[PDB]
Amino acid sequence: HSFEERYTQQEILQSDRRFMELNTENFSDLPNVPTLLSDLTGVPRDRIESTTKPI
DNA sequence: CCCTGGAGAATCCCGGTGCCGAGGCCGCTCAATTGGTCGTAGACAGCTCTAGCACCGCTTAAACGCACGTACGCGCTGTCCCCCGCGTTTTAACCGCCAAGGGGATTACTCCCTAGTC
């Protein structure tokens, strides 16, 4: 029972971007979240800004 | 593909007779006019006083364009579910039937209130 099944792709990606937004310790790295997530999983910043829906 | 002759049926409408009440007519009738008073409250200044008209230079706070962007009102698809028109049944007021009081008037017996004369 993988959590990728109970939680859909959108939900696991939301958990991931919340994780990366917990990684930062300052204001300045909040726009660095798309860059960090693209470095992590290789997703373009377009869908990061379009579908992640951050805090 | 979509239009309609015929038919079923609802509408508009004026004769066409019966009814009850809108309006006129009659008999009171009571309240608005009107004489006055006398004194009350608002018009007429008048002094006052008090908030606003326009003016000056700033201050960035809102206002607006531009560009991205993105998701929602609306319009497309389909089904499904549920309410209507019609057919059958049952409460639901309304008007007749009957024998007995209640009573309101209505009149009959009578009995006291009234009033006359040898």
Contact between the CB of A46 and strand B at under 7 Å? yes
Q: Give CA–CA dist A44/A25, Å, rounded.
A: 23
Contact between the CB of A49 and strand B at under 7 Å? yes
Backbone φ and ψ of A45, nearest 5°: -65, -15
For residue A51, which nucleotide's C1' is closest to its Cα? B70
Q: Which of A54, A49, A52 is nearest to A10 (CA)?
A: A52
- Resolution of the experimentally solved model in angstroms: 3.5
Q: How was this model experimentally determined?
A: cryo-EM
Q: E-strand spans in chain A?
A: none
Q: Which of A31, A9, A7 is nearest to A20 (CA)?
A: A31
Instruction: Give the angle subtended at the CA of A41 by the CAs of A34 and A27, to the nearest 5°.
Output: 25
Q: What amino acid is encoded at A1 in this protein?
A: H
Q: How far is CA A47 from CA A1, A2, A25, A34, A39, in A?
A: 28, 25, 24, 9, 14
